Design a protein around this ligand. Structure first.
Ligand code: PM8
Ligand code: MG
Lengths: 103, 221, 69, 87, 115, 79, 126
């Protein structure tokens, strides 16, 4: 949280923080969000989070027939909540410099 | 006994010298006798064969539904729209461009609206047509069929506010896409005095007769 | 699994008939390309995709969309 | 507006002999049915090009032959000509 | 037609161009003096946190006569030197890239449909 | 023609092959187990000999050749 | 006369491996003959590229416009497009990555073309 999350994109560190949790094998998000099992697909994890909290957003998608407004799970809202939960500490202790410490 | 005149032969209202129109029509009749231009309206299915200048003059084909017949003079044009592979395309062909090899009316039909520009916001299958569909036969001495199809529209927003009275569209199921309050709100732009404004109607009856005399005189010569 | 085994071998040698009649391209690469193409598309066990490979092989023999000479 | 302006480097694609009409390339200043003064181009690259042009002018009465109805350009495709097929 | 901060549709089968969130990349720079992109011009895309150059093949803005008009703005990704990122093109593309001066034979070879 | 000149040409064009191992080359060389040849391999070697020895052999019989003895037999009685 | 017969012969002395010539039907609206050439090193394709264009300019055809080399900065891929013949000089590793032979013989029947998913028009959620 030392820098603003919006200028990097909430999706890129949602996967990165998910990546670090898998590396530490903590899997604290599995029971927190009621997920079936640990997963690595970032989009599918955010889909479950949006499903869990009932967050939906309508977006414009570029199709071959033109622009279509469809309602989709609110991935940015899911990413922001998922990032906030980790920062609050509900996902357990983390260490981002373990790899550089070992060499 | 039904006779049909191509829309571009009737000049727009203005101060242009009629002598220019006479010379423009002479070029049309000289060009028309070489390349036959079949009669068609907006909504008909047209297959146009042209030559691509930068592909070694290879023969080109394109099939689509006519949605607009605008322009006047030798610059008259029509727009064919089709969805190929799932992506919609539009081409504004030129009637008198010598690049055109032949024009074939696959299906001659009329729609409830003069212009089909609202098909862009309509559902994709209302504009998708088979590229190699077999042309259907037209019975001689038969009235031009009129299609009463009311297309279904994609959710708002649209490219243009088709429900407003100025567009005057009668080929859209508005009740399946717009609520009653939205229709009433669009009614505020209605102008009931336009239809009764006698000074803005263009009387072409005296003009079409002159055009027909010129057309038949050239053919006899 | 395919339409018929005899058709598959019949088209394979039919391709070699065309390859023997070719003039411009390289016979060594043409022979090598067709054999390795068959080596990977077989032993699929799906019994339906191999039928799709049959029809695309059939149009290759006809060469109405593209002919290599 | 309402001032005199001149456009340079306009070529003649077609000439109609019967109606005395010149087909100049591009647009010209002035509205419709306005009187425009026309003369030979003064551009340096277009000097010494009146060798074959009529001098001092064309005299149809004294001409030995009758001009065609329309004088076209070599690059201009005639309306009656068959449709162009590119090479 | 296409300028800075304009969403575009990627047509080739490049893995980069496939968005799992259905999010369309937007152009951040147009490689022209006036900053306006017509069919066949080269632009820059900021896609998935990467600044990848792209080539535009179709736009919704109308063009000259007898030129096909697409209802969506289509782009194809290319490398920093000219090679395409994706392997093949599925959506139809204009044939005007032959006449235009530039590196268009690579995309035309991998293209499938002509309109 | 000479009957001897048939068999020696048949085995020579078989020895020209690279992937297969010329371990046992008799008139009864069964390719399924000795050489491990599939339908494609058995078809291809027929083209490997037809190009230099043949031009009158269709598919209706080439699918059931199975041994070098009978191309000698099939060539001999065809001529 | 500059045609495929001389084009293939001009490519023989350049040690051009895996020469492929495909007759393109007029319905494809691209060209008449499509040529694929494999090389060994980046200098080799450049050597072939300069050799073919030098003969093309020198030999005949003053009327038609000149041809520029396409892909000079691209080391792996290089191409040159004449009036009716186009050649794509690329490394064999690029040939496997960019498979071009089947696409110009099978239209929309290619393995990769059959691999891609069709238009879906994403639907609404719940
Ligand atoms: P044999 O009887 O032992 O063979 C039986 C085998 C092959 C083992 C079958 O059981 C099998 O595994 N597959 C049967 C056929 C199959 O799987 N696919 C059909 C092949 S058709 C094909 O590949 C299309 C050919 C197109 C040619 C393209 C070449 C391009 C060169 C430039
Ligand atoms: Mg708009």
């Amino acid at each position: 949280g030392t820098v603003l999350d919006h200028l990097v994109g909430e999706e890129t560190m949602a996967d990165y923080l998910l990546y670090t949790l898998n590396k530490h094998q903590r899997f604290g998000y599995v029971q927190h969000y009621g997920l079936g099992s640990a997963c690595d697909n970032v989009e599918r994890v955010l889909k479950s989070v949006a499903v869990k909290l009932g967050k939906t957003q309508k977006v414009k998608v570029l199709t071959g027939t033109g622009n279509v407004n469809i309602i989709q799970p609110n991935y940015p809202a899911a990413a922001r909540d998922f990032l906030q939960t980790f920062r609050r500490g509900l996902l357990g202790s983390v260490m981002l410099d373990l790899d550089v410490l070992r060499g | 006994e039904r006779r049909f005149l191509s829309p571009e032969f009737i000049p727009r209202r203005g101060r242009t010298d009629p002598l220019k129109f006479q010379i423009e029509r002479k070029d049309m009749l000289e060009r028309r006798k070489v390349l036959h231009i079949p009669e068609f309206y907006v909504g008909s299915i047209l297959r146009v064969t042209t030559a691509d200048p930068y592909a070694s003059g290879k023969i080109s084909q394109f099939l689509g539904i006519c949605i607009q017949r605008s322009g006047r003079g030798l610059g008259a044009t029509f727009i064919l729209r089709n969805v190929i592979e799932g992506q919609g395309v539009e081409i504004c062909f030129e009637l008198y461009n010598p690049r055109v090899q032949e024009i074939q009316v696959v299906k001659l039909e009329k729609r409830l609206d003069d212009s089909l520009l609202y098909l862009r916001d309509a559902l994709p299958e209302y504009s998708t047509f088979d590229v190699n569909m077999k042309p259907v036969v037209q019975e001689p001495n038969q009235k031009v069929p009129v299609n009463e199809l009311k297309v279904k529209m994609k959710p708002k927003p649209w490219s243009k506010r088709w429900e407003r009275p100025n567009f005057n569209i009668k080929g859209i199921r508005f009740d399946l896409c717009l609520t009653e309050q939205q229709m009433k709100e669009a009614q505020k732009w209605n102008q009931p005095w336009l239809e009764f404004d006698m000074m803005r109607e263009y009387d072409t009856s005296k003009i079409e007769a002159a055009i027909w005399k010129e057309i038949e005189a050239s053919k006899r010569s | 699994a395919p339409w018929s085994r005899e058709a598959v071998l019949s088209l394979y040698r039919a391709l070699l008939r065309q390859g023997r009649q070719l003039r411009y391209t390289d016979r060594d690469f043409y022979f090598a390309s067709i054999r390795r193409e068959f080596r990977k598309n077989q032993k699929l066990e799906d019994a339906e995709a191999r039928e799709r490979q049959l029809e695309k092989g059939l149009v290759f023999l006809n060469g109405k969309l593209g002919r290599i000479i | 507006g309402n001032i005199y302006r001149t456009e340079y480097g306009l070529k003649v694609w077609r000439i109609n002999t019967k109606h005395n009409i010149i087909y100049v390339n591009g647009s010209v200043p002035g509205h419709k049915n306005c009187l425009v003064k026309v003369k030979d181009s003064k551009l340096p690259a277009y000097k010494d090009l009146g060798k074959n042009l009529p001098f001092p002018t064309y005299f149809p009465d004294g001409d030995e032959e009758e001009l065609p109805e329309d004088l076209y350009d070599e690059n201009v495709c005639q309306p009656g000509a068959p449709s162009i097929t590119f090479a | 037609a296409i300028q800075k901060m304009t969403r575009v549709r990627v047509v080739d089968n490049s893995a980069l161009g496939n968005s799992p969130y259905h999010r369309a990349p937007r152009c951040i720079h147009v490689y022209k003096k006036n900053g306006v992109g017509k069919v066949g011009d080269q632009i820059l895309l900021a896609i998935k946190g990467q600044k990848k150059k792209a080539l535009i093949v179709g736009h919704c803005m109308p063009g000259p006569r007898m030129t096909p008009r697409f209802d969506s703005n289509n782009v194809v990704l290319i490398e920093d030197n000219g090679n395409p990122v994706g392997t093949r093109i599925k959506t139809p593309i204009p044939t005007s890239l032959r006449k235009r001066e530039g590196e268009y034979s690579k995309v035309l070879a991998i293209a499938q449909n002509f309109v | 023609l000479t009957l001897e000149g048939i068999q020696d040409r048949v085995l020579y064009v078989l020895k020209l092959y690279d992937k297969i191992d010329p371990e046992k080359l008799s008139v009864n060389s069964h390719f399924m187990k000795d050489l491990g040849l599939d339908s494609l391999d058995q078809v291809e070697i027929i083209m490997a000999m037809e190009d230099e020895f043949g031009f009158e052999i269709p598919d209706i019989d080439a699918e059931k050749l199975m041994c070098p003895q009978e191309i000698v037999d099939y060539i001999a009685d065809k001529k | 006369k500059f045609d495929i017969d001389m084009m293939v012969s001009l490519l023989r002395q350049e040690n051009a491996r895996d020469i492929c010539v495909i007759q393109v039907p007029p319905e494809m609206r691209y060209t008449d003959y499509f040529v694929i050439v494999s090389g060994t090193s980046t200098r080799h394709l450049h050597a072939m590229a300069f050799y073919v264009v030098k003969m093309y300019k020198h030999l005949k055809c003053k009327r038609d416009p000149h041809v520029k080399i396409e892909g000079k900065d691209t080391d792996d891929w290089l191409c040159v497009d004449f009036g009716s013949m186009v050649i794509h000089l690329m490394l064999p590793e690029t040939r496997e990555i960019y498979e071009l032979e089947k696409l110009w013989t099978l239209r929309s029947y290619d393995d990769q073309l059959a691999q891609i998913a069709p238009e879906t028009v994403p639907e609404d959620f719940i």
